[PDB]
Amino acid sequence: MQLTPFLILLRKTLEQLQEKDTGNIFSEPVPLSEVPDYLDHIKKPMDFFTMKQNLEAYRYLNFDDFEEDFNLIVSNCLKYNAKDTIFYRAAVRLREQGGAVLRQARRQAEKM
Numbered sequence: 001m002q003l004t005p006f007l008i009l010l011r012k013t014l015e016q017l018q019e020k021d022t023g024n025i026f027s028e029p030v031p032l033s034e035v036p037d038y039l040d041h042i043k044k045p046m047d048f049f050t051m052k053q054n055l056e057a058y059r060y061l062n063f064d065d066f067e068e069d070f071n072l073i074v075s076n077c078l079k080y081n082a083k084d085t086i087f088y089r090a091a092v093r094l095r096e097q098g099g100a101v102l103r104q105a106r107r108q109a110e111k112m
């Protein structure tokens with residue numbers, strides 16, 4: 001497997017995942033200045049901007065490490081926010097819509 005086509009695929013996949021987050025509520029880190037208690041039980045914050053930085057820092061060299069950080073976006077949001085909030089339901093919807101995006105991307109990857 002060559003690195004360049006794989007990273008091209010992860011760039012496209014990340015774009016597709018971001019497209020499912022229509023509110024852009026996961027686009028940037030959770031602002032600790034406005035959610036001061038966030039790090040109390042969120043041990044590894046994650047967001048799409050950070051994922052793009054990690055991608056270009058060559059920190060995703062296989063599909064599972066990329067998918068792991070996407071799952072953190074979802075799981076952190078489910079953990080922090082009460083079930084009856086817009087945030088929690090947005091994470092549920094992202095988990096659902098992102099799963100199809102990830103399965104199709106991984107099919108593409110395994111063909112490489």
Ligand SMILES: O=c1[nH]c2[nH]c(=S)[nH]c(=O)c2[nH]1
Pocket residue numbers: 025026028029030031035076077080081087
């Ligand atoms: O109360 C909350 N504010 C915020 N902000 C962001 S960016 N993500 C959240 O899960 C959240 N929960």
